[PDB]
Amino acid sequence: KHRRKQKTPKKF
Amino acid sequence: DAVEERVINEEYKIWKKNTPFLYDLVMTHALEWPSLTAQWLPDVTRPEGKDFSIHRLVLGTHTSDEQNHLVIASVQLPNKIEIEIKINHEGEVNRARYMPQNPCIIATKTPSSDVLVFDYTKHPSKPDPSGECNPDLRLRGHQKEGYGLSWNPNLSGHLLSASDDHTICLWDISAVPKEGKVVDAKTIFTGHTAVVEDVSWHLLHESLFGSVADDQKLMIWDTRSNNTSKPSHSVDAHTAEVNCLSFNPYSEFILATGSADKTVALWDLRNLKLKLHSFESHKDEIFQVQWSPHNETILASSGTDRRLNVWDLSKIGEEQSPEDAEDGPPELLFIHGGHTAKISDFSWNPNEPWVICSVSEDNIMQVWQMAENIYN
């Protein structure tokens, strides 16, 4: 199953 | 060679060219960090002699560094999106939900497994530069992080939480002053044998709530029962993990579940041995499902296919054009294809009908409303 939250989020 | 990014970019272009014919409102805003949660605040202020009202959203941050925040943003809706309050949060905000009886109180789910309770009127508009998280209440009882979080709308201060530790925690903070103390769970429900992905109180009967888990099961619980290891009803809901559930606010017997089997299942509490309907269109695992607060037959679902489907159960079984049948089933009202990444959460605006805020993994927050001629 897909992770509920991504491993490494990125800053904008 | 995962150029799904090629498919995404091209679909987005075609969507962006078709925003005018399918939408009455499209607002796009890139956040500093992506948000895993989104929920409109129930208050709305309409200034005199102006064409817009101010709505508020409960957001969070998902950062890789150690500067996470619980966020409250303001939105100017017709008839500009800016951040208003940033509160220091220990770890990323898995989910944030306000208390219906007091929207100043906001519960959050943290990676440390703790549930935090914030009174955002007791925090400065600028976050504490020291980096300390000072929650007005720290709710303890979970071993792992989670995502199910539900305030009881008929029993003030009764909060449920679903975690990856296979348990559901219930807290009664109604008699606890919010002065930063640690409150242990009043009750822990252990019926599931896998990650409990979501939990939700029944919106009318104060003793009933539902839970969905990685064991593909939907469970209906009664707090009046003395057995906390076995629910009232256990339903083989899906052919894969179930990530979300949502009770109909106008139909006390109806609820919906979304699953990794790419479907949304309709349920009737009076006979849970038969799945009422199976909504099919989604191309990947579904993370969130929410009933419309204005129409009892309107329901929406979002997930890892980067789409948000809006369903109309009153259109189930309708005869349709063969070409129309290619676009989807008749009960499929609308496909929002504005996001280019996985949608983490979405919220129906409770004061503006058909307005939806959805947040995605690419820091994108979108406030949109499908064209009136589509639903009307």
Numbering used by the authors:
A (entry chain D): 1 to 12
B (entry chain A): 10 to 88, 114 to 410
Q: What does the literature reporting this entry say, word for word?
A:
ZNF512B, previously named GAM/ZFp, is a vertebrate-specific ZF protein. One common protein identified in all screens was the ZF protein ZNF512B, which comprises eight ZF domains, arranged in four pairs. In addition to its eight ZF domains, closer examination of the amino acid composition of the human ZNF512B protein revealed a sequence within its internal region (I), resembling the known NuRD interaction motif (NIM), also referred to as the FOG-1-like motif. We have identified ZNF512B as an RBBP4-mediated NuRD complex-interacting protein that represses transcription in both a NuRD-dependent and -independent manner.
